[PDB]
């Protein structure tokens, strides 16, 4: 451990925070300040319209879609007292989920996944949350998230979310993320069902490529889901003063959910390995059949050619004047040995 | 004391004594020139390129008050980069690289640095280094290098070496892009060998870059009396640069492993294809030459007279059986 400082970079001025991503098509800010009685929501683009809600009596939810504009991120972090290294972590995308507990806020890094049925690619969007005393700050890369049910609960007064503080808002966001992971695993179920129905009767190299792609996706999901278990454990077992003594059982429930998700991921990886093994066994069996045909034809015919060669030389002194002309006896011997070899093959159950 | 490696012995000594007001430089080839430079308060940079000749390095070893174990380490070139802190100096082991694009070869060269008060030692093994920018900075007073002590010179040498690693990463990035383009589409028998060479080079890179990060960490984390606290942020910056290098190397190794895997898959299809070819060719021919041998025998009774010109009948039945097996192999989707 050591003191937190803005890490230096080569070919880059010290004060620059760089968005480590590839989504640069959109930007907006969602604000949902809700009390137990009334709530007001809006969408803006000016940064300064959301700064007043830092010292908010009631919980407020700020959703800054689009971090490619680092200016808004830096301004919000400066106004909310966020550490510069935390802002660097927000803009950095190529990193694993984590939390860092500070004096005034907790900083959670999370991942969102979307599965495409065309060519079977898995895409990861990093989402980060900051739980201050009276607000939740959420940053996203691009438009399109999974917290729509939480928004519906906030707007329609379904549940206890309006009667609770920002810690319940954080819990609801994490729960929505876990539900998204469950739906993603269902989609992987559908993909594995398709792969099963294809591999058994249509084996080829494209099936190998698809199987390896699915295995890579499973590896990525495990690598990103294990730190989710770590982070939920650290949330409900190392509770800071920001998180109330209550709502801890909700964090425990989410931890149980992520344990279930990790176990499901492991079983999925085992199943895809089994599919690969089935394909290997099938191609090996085809190789067996080809080997069997080749060795059977060789076993049947090579003795025949060899004996034809033995009696096909020219020495001018051979017992070639025998009863029944000899040559028919040679053919009878060859037929007998050929049918003997065929009978041995039939006894060993080849062809 | 013996030299482990294989490079040519070219014993050349460079001396660069500099101060804030003015510097002084001379290039000689005698050992005695660098002995009297342990007293000047002005920082002095001492180079000994030809480490192969153990006589000069031994004279340095007893004159500079260092244990012969570090002399053995200096001569030992097959050594990972490690740093040693001692009561009177610091010994740092580093590695210099040179990637030839033509042969796709990643060569290495161990250079060791010893920092005594008011002087810096440095031992190459081949002609040519990458610390020329530091030489120009000292010569033309381009920076604050002449306003600072020898710890700043050690920092500058390490930083220039890190920049050399950055240039190496640029070259290897170009090569990885080209090789990925060649592997993903239009494979060939040479691309697999190129990919293996790239993987070996990346393994050497990581094995030489992780100890460098550890050396920088152990360098700035603790401050021995030889080093001042002024250079600690500078060494922190160098440590961050090594973090960048390590992350890039890891990503490159992952990419190369993916390219290896995509080729490694689907070999059983090739085995099935070569089986198909061999079995089809060897099946429609062994019976044919068998019949040829039967009719090529030397028995006297065999009927070989007229019979609709003779050989036409055997040719006809031979073609019949050939097309029979051809039609059979048309089944099972072999042909």
């Amino acid at each position, epitope marked *: 451990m050591e003191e937190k400082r803005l890490s230096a970079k080569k070919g880059l001025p010290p*004060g620059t925070l760089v968005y480590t*991503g590839k989504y640069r098509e959109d930007f907006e800010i969602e604000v949902m300040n809700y009390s137990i009685e009334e709530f007001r929501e809006f969408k803006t683009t000016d940064v300064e319209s959301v700064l007043p809600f830092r010292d908010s009596s009631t919980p407020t939810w700020i959703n800054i879609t689009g971090i490619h504009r680092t200016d808004v991120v830096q301004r919000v972090g400066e106004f909310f007292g966020i550490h510069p290294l935390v802002l660097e972590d927000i803009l950095n995308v190529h990193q694993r989920p984590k939390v860092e507990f500070f004096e005034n806020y907790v900083f959670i890094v999370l991942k969102m996944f979307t599965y495409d049925k065309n060519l079977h690619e898995l895409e990861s969007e990093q989402v980060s949350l900051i739980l201050t005393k009276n607000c939740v700050l959420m940053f996203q890369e691009k438009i399109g998230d999974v917290f729509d049910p939480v928004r519906e609960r906030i707007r329609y007064n379904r549940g206890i979310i309006r009667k609770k503080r920002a810690d319940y808002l954080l819990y609801s966001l994490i729960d929505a993320l876990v539900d998204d992971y469950f739906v993603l695993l269902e989609k992987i179920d559908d993909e594995i069902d398709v792969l099963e129905e294809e591999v058994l009767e249509r084996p080829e190299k494209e099936t190998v490529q698809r199987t390896h792609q699915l295995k890579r996706n499973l590896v990525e999901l495990r690598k990103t889901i294990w730190p989710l278990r770590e982070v939920l454990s650290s949330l409900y077992r190392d509770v800071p003063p920001l998180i109330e003594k209550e709502t801890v059982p909700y964090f425990r429930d989410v931890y149980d959910h992520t344990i279930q998700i990790a176990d499901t991921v492991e079983t999925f990886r085992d199943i895809v390995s089994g599919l690969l093994d089935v394909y290997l066994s099938s191609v090996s069996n085809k190789t067996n059949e080809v080997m069997k045909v080749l060795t059977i034809i060789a076993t049947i015919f090579m003795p025949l050619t060899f004996i034809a060669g033995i009696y096909g030389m020219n020495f001018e002194y051979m017992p070639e004047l025998r009863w029944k002309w000899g040559y028919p006896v040679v053919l009878a011997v060859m037929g007998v040995i050929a049918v003997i070899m065929v009978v041995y093959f039939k006894k060993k159950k080849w062809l | 004391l013996v030299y482990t490696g294989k490079y040519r012995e070219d014993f050349e000594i460079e001396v660069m004594n500099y101060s804030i007001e003015e510097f002084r430089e001379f290039k000689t080839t005698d050992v005695e020139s660098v002995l009297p430079f342990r007293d000047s308060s002005t920082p002095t940079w001492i180079n000994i390129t030809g480490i192969h000749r153990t006589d000069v390095v031994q004279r340095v070893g007893e004159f500079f008050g260092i244990h012969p174990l570090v002399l053995e380490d200096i001569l030992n070139v097959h050594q990972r980069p490690k740093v040693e802190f001692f009561e009177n100096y610091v010994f740092i082991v580093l590695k210099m690289f040179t990637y030839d694009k033509n042969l796709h070869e990643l060569e290495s060269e161990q250079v060791s640095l010893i920092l005594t008060k008011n002087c810096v030692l440095m031992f190459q093994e081949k002609i040519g280094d990458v610390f020329d920018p530091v030489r120009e900075r000292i010569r033309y007073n381009r920076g604050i290098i002449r306003k600072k002590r020898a710890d700043y010179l050690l920092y500058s040498l390490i930083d220039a070496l890190v920049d050399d690693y950055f240039v190496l*990463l*640029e070259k290897i*990035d*170009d090569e990885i892009d080209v090789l990925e383009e060649e592997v993903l589409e239009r494979p060939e028998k040479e691309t697999v060998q190129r990919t293996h060479q790239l993987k070996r080079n990346l393994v050497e890179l990581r094995k030489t870059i992780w100890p460098l990060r550890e050396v920088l960490s152990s360098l700035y984390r603790d401050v021995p009396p030889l080093i001042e606290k002024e250079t600690v942020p500078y060494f922190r910056d160098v440590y961050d640069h090594t973090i960048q290098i390590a992350d*890039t190397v890891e990503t490159f190794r992952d990419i190369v492993s993916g390219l290896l895997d995509v080729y490694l898959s689907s070999v059983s299809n090739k085995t099935n294809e070569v089986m198909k070819v061999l079995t089809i060719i060897a099946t429609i021919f062994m019976p044919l030459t068998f019949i040829a041998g039967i009719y090529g025998m030397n028995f006297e009774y065999m009927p070989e007279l007229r019979w609709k010109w003779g050989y036409p009948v055997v040719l006809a039945v031979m073609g019949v059986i050939a097309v029979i097996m051809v039609v059979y192999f048309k089944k099972k989707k072999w042909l």
Partner: antibody
Amino acid sequence: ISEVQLVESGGGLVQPGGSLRLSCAASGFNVSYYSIHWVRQAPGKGLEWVASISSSSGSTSYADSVKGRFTISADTSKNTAYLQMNSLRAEDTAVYYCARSYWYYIWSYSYGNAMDYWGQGTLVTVSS
Amino acid sequence: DIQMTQSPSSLSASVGDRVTITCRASQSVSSAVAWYQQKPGKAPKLLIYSASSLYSGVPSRFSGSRSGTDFTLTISSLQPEDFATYYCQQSSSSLITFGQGTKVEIK
């Protein structure tokens, strides 16, 4: 608020060896969080890069052809960058574009920037 | 420094055709190459950045590629408003340089 716009003014006729400063007014963004570039284009010539400035760190960088003469600076309060030209030779008669660039990520070691918005160009001519 | 060589320096093609403009780097630039276009009398406009990525707010007909130190801008289909001058630019180093340009006119 409003749209991003880079505005350049102050470029015009000058005798050889005469020093004139170019100011790059910026609207729609804060100059502190971005890097402001200057780009020069002679009549019937390609684009050429001349200078750069990092306001949030005071880091400057100049092209070799103009290094030592041109000096770049940008005060945060006025939200405007300045490029002071002196000893302006006859070969420098051109039109000056002021731009704004953002950093993007390729690999851990490698960074590159691209210029979103340009101005309109001040025609700095040198004659007599 | 680092130099780009953009060829051809003047191109002629008709609307609906396919245009391929390639510029090579004197040394390594790790995909830190961006493409621009400038109609005469107006400031340049960004088209492609990072040598592959299409900018936000430009037509999808434009494309960019990288092959070692070779960078190609390809237009799937020309348009009457696409007849301008195209440039290269490297930004790997702190000193960024432009290609000499490539004009396009009708044929």
